Design a protein that fits this description.
Radius of gyration of chain D: 18 Å
Number of domains of chain A: 1
Strand content of chain D: 15-25%
Strand order of the largest sheet of chain D: 3-6-1-7
Bound molecules: magnesium ion, zinc ion
Radius of gyration of chain A: 22 Å
Distance between the termini of chain D: 41 Å
Largest interface: A-C, 38 and 56 residues
Chains: A alpha+beta (118), B mainly alpha (29), C alpha+beta (146), D alpha+beta (183), E mainly beta (37), F alpha+beta (150), G alpha+beta (80), H alpha+beta (140)
Oligomer: part of a larger assembly
Helix content of chain A: 25-40%
Number of helices of chain A: 6
Distance between the termini of chain A: 39 Å
Largest sheet of chain D: 4 strands, antiparallel
Structural class of chain D: alpha+beta
Structural class of chain A: alpha+beta
Strand content of chain A: 5-15%
Number of strands of chain D: 9
Number of strands of chain A: 3
Chain lengths: 118, 29, 146, 183, 37, 150, 80, 140
RNA sequence: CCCAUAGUAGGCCUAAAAGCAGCCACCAAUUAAGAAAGCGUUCAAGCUCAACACAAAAAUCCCAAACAUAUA
RNA sequence: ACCUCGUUGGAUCAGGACAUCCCGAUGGUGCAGCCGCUAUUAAAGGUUCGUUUGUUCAACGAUUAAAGUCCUACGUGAU
């Protein structure tokens, strides 16, 4: 589900991924959103690549990384799977997801005037 | 290039200042 | 809450309106937030709190009507903006990149093509500075810029 | 003469002698026969052009029957051209008459921003208010450590970094610059 | 639009709006008053 | 400003002012006026019959003509602030007059009723309806005023 | 607009909405350009009727309503 | 629209003070001056007279006139032709309180001028203030 | 927010300059009132105020990766 | 505080900036259309040949949509 990552703040629009083809005029600067639309794996891949130590083991380590944009995973990889790590960020619930019992449990904070359009 | 003062640096300086104030007190008698 | 109904003839009927829950923890306070002891204990994701000050289509309600403080009205407005941009109010809408804690409207920020040197880095704002005084449960202060 | 009198570019008879920029000003720090003024929030040098533009911009939006403006700084005398030294806290131009502070606030702020050094448009009430709130700051600060205390006691051996003038300036005045927020 | 460091409404119909990240003075009656921060 | 020695910068940072912090927010914690008073007090006894209208939709010239036609009679038209008129009702003990004066209100104080001709004049302008008044401490609605006129 | 009739009972419980409505819209400042209208104010919960000679009658029970709502409704109906 | 003029009854056709100022709305100068001369005959001749002409949208004339001016009237009562320069110290003629009351008797009667105040004080104070602003001393 | 009747275009001169060319008093009606603090008219006319009322940059290619709330 | 005076282009190939000379998109205009002027955005592309001068330049001639301002150790002389 690397396609469904979430950036905090305006990083989708402000974070810029820079690359150079090596040729003159080959400098490319692409925002996080554009890079995500192009490759739904590049953002997580690049974050991991940057966090790994900058030595000759890094690309071997990246060979053990398997990124999949969606819920689909190849069968052999799925059979290899051993453990699932807890998600680092707990996803906040939407009102559409909250149960009526929870809404009732949460108190009403104020008395709205009856003669109000709202 | 400019340099900036961190909270850790401020805390270190404050620790030193507290030691010096206690030195003042113990030298006052 | 009065609602206008048409048939042309139009008339306004006052319907059922919710009331403040019984037994406020701190009665006789300025704002509902002070009355219920929530001065620095809500965030952008507390939709149950935030939606109580929201028009059915997502807009904020005026401070005069809500009774909120000026600072608390600003905090609620910004938290509601962040909740909307994070998609936590799917039903409070006028009629795909996941986000959260987005201070600015997505279409109004420019890409940071030239982040500065280390001493003058252009940082990406995260969250809102209005919530800077919230309760701190972490050893390090939460960063407003990334 | 309810107007800013023209000042000579240079004194007729040069004077031999009698850093005039660093530190607080000692003279003309208080209102004298005026109600509003321009206060210098930092030291600097006033040129003849600066004086001429002061006079022009003051006498332009001027009501001689209701406003009278006077200088507090003498004519450019220090040779370099001739200039006048000004220290922080020195009043530059004073005003008085049957008038209210907002009547002059606009162009006083404009001319203060015109001034080469930091400057402010200050009434008698505003000057008293800022002095009183500065006293309140230095009386109610919750910091146990003050520049004055540390410098005087030579805590941390800080006088190796500080100046002898820092002991008297108490950290508020650093060079020609003045830091009113600095308690 | 005219680029101004400080935005000043000129007539009554000049209104300040923060759009696309920056402040503007728009005006229906006098488009000459259009200002951009 | 030239760069300070870093030790001096640390000193300034450590000696920065710290404002006192209250535990609980105080915010979130708990002669024209007398001239009008005396003039309205005197008027309440001077007038015998009183009426009120909403003379605001009229132009300057139309209001001037209306004032001229009223001054043709002994009736005098008045405008006074509701902000100060609300205390006047309870001061003069006019309880039924509270739900009568809100927004624009123009009094028509008089002692001789030319209300027949005033209503006739108002008829040619199909707006500005008559509002209930209270003659000599006796409230009269619009129907009561019409009956009194007839 | 062809005709408009405004009725209210300030003798009974007051309704400032229709009062402000008639003070603002039922003014010659508007009628100067809206000369085609004939306004009548018959005072005795309230009721604002508007007759258009073409096909329309608009009845406003402006008891719970307010001045802004009724002005906007009137403008929308005028636009038609 | 209302057009305000302070023309003298003697010279009914001074020229520029009437022609261009009235021709913008569309007027008949012949009829206007004829009615002005009719009012001049109805009243004393050779004295400035304020007018209250209202040019109706139907292009018709309704000239309204009343008492003469106040400045010239006071100057004539004091035997003065040209007003004083300073008007704070200069004086040429003195008018007694009895004369002020006598001239005020026939003053609070016009409709357009709005001098309709019932009390004598409301008019006497205004005329005394006007005389004081002019170069006339109020005796006793 | 709302709009501002009128003694009188207040007079001196100023072709007229009336509130806007200038100086002199700066009164007065209703209830509320500047012989006007600012636009525009040769001058008027038209408009507001007040009064009632309710900040920045540059040249080979941006430059750790990233992160807002787990116990100090 | 007297006088004086203390490596450079060109050719070739160009890389880059945008503070845009032209081409693109807009706002305003004391522009009715044509236009001009001004401002925002835009660096993908383009940006001439000659006479005198060693000219670094400059002037002139003829053009051009335009004949941009610069940085690159004259950018570049083991070409
Ligand atoms: Mg550009
Ligand atoms: Zn405008
Ligand atoms: Zn509160």
């Amino acid at each position: 589900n690397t396609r469904h990552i979430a950036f905090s703040g305006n990083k989708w629009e402000q974070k810029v991924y820079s690359s150079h083809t090596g040729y003159p005029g080959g400098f490319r600067q692409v925002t996080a959103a554009q890079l995500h639309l192009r490759d739904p794996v590049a953002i997580v891949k690049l974050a991991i690549y940057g966090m790994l130590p900058k030595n000759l083991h890094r690309r071997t380590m990246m060979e053990r990384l398997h990124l999949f944009p969606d819920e689909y995973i190849p069968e052999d990889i799925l059979k290899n799977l051993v453990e699932e790590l807890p998600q680092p960020r707990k996803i906040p619930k939407r009102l559409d997801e909250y149960t009526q019992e929870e809404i009732d449990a949460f108190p009403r904070l104020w008395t709205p005037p009856e003669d109000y359009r709202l | 290039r400019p340099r900036f003062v961190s909270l850790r640096a401020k805390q270190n300086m404050i620790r030193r200042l507290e030691i010096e104030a206690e030195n003042h007190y113990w030298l006052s008698m | 809450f009065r609602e206008v109904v048409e048939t042309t003839i139009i008339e306004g009927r006052i319907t059922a309106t919710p009331k403040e829950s019984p037994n406020p923890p701190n009665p006789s306070g300025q704002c509902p937030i002070c009355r219920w002891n929530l001065k620095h204990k809500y965030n952008y994701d507390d939709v149950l709190l935030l939606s109580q000050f929201i028009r059915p289509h997502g807009g904020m309600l005026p401070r005069k009507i809500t009774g909120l403080c000026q600072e608390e009205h600003r905090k609620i407005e910004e938290c509601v903006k962040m909740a909307h941009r994070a998609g936590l109010l799917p039903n409070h809408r006028p009629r795909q990149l996941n986000r959260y804690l987005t201070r600015w409207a997505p279409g109004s920020v420019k890409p940071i093509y030239k982040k500065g040197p280390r001493w003058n880095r252009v940082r990406m704002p995260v969250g809102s500075p209005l919530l800077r005084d919230n309760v701190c449960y972490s050893r390090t202060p939460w960063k407003l810029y990334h | 003469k309810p107007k800013l009198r023209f000042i000579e570019r240079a004194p007729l008879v040069p004077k031999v002698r009698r850093s005039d920029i660093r530190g607080p000003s000692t003279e003309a720090t208080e209102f004298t026969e005026g109600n509003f003024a321009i206060l210098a929030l930092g030291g600097g040098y006033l040129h003849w052009g600066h004086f001429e533009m002061m006079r022009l911009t003051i006498n332009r939006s001027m009501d001689p029957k209701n406003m009278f403006a006077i200088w507090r700084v003498p004519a450019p005398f220090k040779p370099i051209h001739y200039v006048t030294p000004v220290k922080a806290g020195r009043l530059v131009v004073e005003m008085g008459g049957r008038c209210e502070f907002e009547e002059v606030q606009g162009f006083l702020d404009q001319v203060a921003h015109k001034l080469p050094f930091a400057a402010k448009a200050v009434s008698r009430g505003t000057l008293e208010k800022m002095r009183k709130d500065q006293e309140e700051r230095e009386r109610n600060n919750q910091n146990p450590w003050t520049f004055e205390r540390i410098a005087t006691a030579n805590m941390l051996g800080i006088r190796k970094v500080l100046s002898p003038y820092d002991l008297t300036h108490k950290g508020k005045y650093w060079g020609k610059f003045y830091m009113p927020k600095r308690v | 639009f005219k680029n101004k460091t400080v935005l000043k409404k000129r007539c009554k119909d000049c209104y300040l709006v923060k759009r696309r990240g920056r402040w503007y003075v728009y005006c229906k009656t006098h488009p000459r008053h259009k200002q951009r921060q | 400003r030239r760069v300070m020695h870093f030790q001096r910068q640390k000193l300034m940072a450590v000696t920065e002012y710290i404002p006192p912090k209250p535990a609980i927010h105080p915010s979130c914690l708990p002669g024209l006026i007398r001239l009008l008073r005396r003039e309205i007090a005197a008027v309440f006894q001077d007038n015998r019959m009183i009426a009120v209208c909403q003379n605001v939709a009229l132009s300057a010239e139309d209001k001037l003509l209306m004032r001229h036609q009223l001054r043709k009679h002994k009736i005098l038209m008045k405008v006074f602030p509701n902000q100060v008129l609300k205390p006047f009702l309870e001061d003069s003990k006019y309880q039924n007059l509270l739900p009568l004066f809100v927004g624009h209100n123009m009094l028509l104080v008089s002692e001789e009723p030319k209300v027949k001709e005033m209503v006739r004049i108002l008829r040619t302008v199909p707006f500005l309806p008559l509002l209930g008044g209270c003659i000599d401490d006796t409230i009269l609605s619009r129907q009561g005023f019409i009956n009194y006129s007839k | 607009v062809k005709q408009v009739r405004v009725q209210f009972c300030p003798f009974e419980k007051n309704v400032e909405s229709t009062r402000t409505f008639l003070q603002t819209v039922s003014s010659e400042k508007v009628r100067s350009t809206n000369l085609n209208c004939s306004v009548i104010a018959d005072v005795r919960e309230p009721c604002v009727d508007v007759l258009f000679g073409d096909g329309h009658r608009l009845i406003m029970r402006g008891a719970h309503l307010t001045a802004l709502e009724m002005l906007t409704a009137f403008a929308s109906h005028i636009r038609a | 629209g209302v057009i305000r003029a302070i023309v003298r009854a003697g010279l009914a056709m001074p020229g520029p003070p009437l022609g261009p100022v009235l021709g913008q709305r569309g007027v008949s100068i012949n009829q206007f001056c004829k009615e002005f001369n009719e009012r001049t005959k109805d009243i004393k001749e050779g004295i400035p007279l304020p007018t209250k002409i209202l040019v109706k949208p139907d292009r018709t004339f309704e000239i309204k006139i009343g008492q003469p001016t106040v400045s010239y009237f006071l100057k004539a009562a004091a035997g003065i032709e040209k007003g004083a320069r300073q008007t704070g110290k200069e004086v040429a003629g003195l008018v007694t309180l009895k004369h002020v009351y006598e001239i005020a008797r026939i003053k609070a009667q016009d409709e357009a001028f709005a001098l309709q105040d019932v009390p004598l004080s409301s008019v006497v104070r205004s005329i005394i203030g006007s005389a004081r602003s002019l170069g006339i001393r109020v005796v006793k």
